[PDB]
Amino acid sequence: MSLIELLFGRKQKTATVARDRLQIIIAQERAQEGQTPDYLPTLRKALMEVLSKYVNVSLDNIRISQEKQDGMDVLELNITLPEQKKVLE
Amino acid sequence: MSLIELLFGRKQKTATVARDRLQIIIAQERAQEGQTPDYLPTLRKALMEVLSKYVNVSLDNIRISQEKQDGMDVLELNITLPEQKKVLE
């Protein structure tokens, strides 16, 4: 029932990654009704700018994978958050 | 293999919704390494403000459902895009 199971339902992922990751899956569904598309590159843009700012990720670690189909589009975005907190002063 | 199948693998939905919907699933995974959270309410905020602006949705049609678990958090957000393009002039 819980998605957390399907997303990580691949046995035990033991071992410490020592890092952070982000997997944002967008599923936009639009009915024949309505026109003028402009939502896919909209969310991605805000995320690319927000993450680059709010998060410490270089456009070099940004994985993009768009998938369009009829009136259904799905943008798979996976970002790997690096580590560099460094001690205090 | 394709997610589009699992997401809509519920027989044929048929029938025209005459509307648009958005289902953004966020799956943040962080290893014991690192501290000071602040990522879940970060993406949601930018989305709530971006959508309210870039998209025509009232905070009344915003469905929020957070789900935390150990070092894994999943925020399920579903927005229903209304219709009101109206003819031209």
Side-chain angles (χ1 to χ4, degrees), chain A residues 2-4 7-8 13 16-36 39 42-43 46-47 50-51 54-55 67 69 72 74 81 83 85, chain B residues 2-4 7-8 13 16-36 39 42-43 46-47 50-51 54-55 67 69 72 74 81 83 85:
Chain A
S2 179
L3 279 60
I4 297 163
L7 293 167
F8 295 101
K13 195 187 180 181
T16 60
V17 196
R19 263 150 59 201
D20 280 14
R21 181 172 293 172
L22 259 159
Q23 180 172 343
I24 301 169
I25 301 169
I26 300 170
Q28 181 172 237
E29 183 176 41
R30 52 179 294 278
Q32 58 181 170
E33 187 70 9
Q35 292 182 47
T36 313
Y39 297 90
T42 300
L43 290 154
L47 291 168
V50 168
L51 291 166
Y54 284 75
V55 185
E67 291 183 5
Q69 184 176 47
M72 189 173 278
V74 177
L81 269 61
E83 51 184 352
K85 187 185 293 198
Chain B
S2 179
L3 279 60
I4 297 163
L7 293 167
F8 295 101
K13 197 175 181 179
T16 61
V17 196
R19 263 150 59 201
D20 281 12
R21 182 172 293 172
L22 259 159
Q23 181 173 343
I24 301 169
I25 301 169
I26 300 170
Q28 181 173 238
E29 185 178 18
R30 52 179 294 278
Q32 59 182 167
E33 187 70 8
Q35 292 181 48
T36 315
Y39 292 96
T42 300
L43 290 154
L47 291 169
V50 168
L51 291 165
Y54 284 74
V55 185
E67 291 183 5
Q69 184 176 45
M72 189 173 278
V74 178
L81 269 61
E83 50 183 352
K85 187 184 293 197

Side-chain angles (χ1 to χ4, degrees), chain A residues 25-27 43, chain B residues 21-26 43-45 47-48 51 61-66 74-80:
Chain A
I25 301 169
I26 300 170
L43 290 154
Chain B
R21 182 172 293 172
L22 259 159
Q23 181 173 343
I24 301 169
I25 301 169
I26 300 170
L43 290 154
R44 176 174 63 86
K45 185 183 180 181
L47 291 169
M48 284 292 131
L51 291 165
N61 294 322
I62 274 57
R63 175 173 293 172
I64 294 169
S65 164
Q66 185 177 1
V74 178
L75 221 169
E76 184 177 13
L77 189 86
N78 197 178
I79 317 87
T80 320

Side-chain angles (χ1 to χ4, degrees), chain A residues 67-79:
Chain A
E67 291 183 5
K68 59 182 183 293
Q69 184 176 47
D70 289 347
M72 189 173 278
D73 291 347
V74 177
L75 220 168
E76 184 177 13
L77 189 85
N78 196 178
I79 317 87

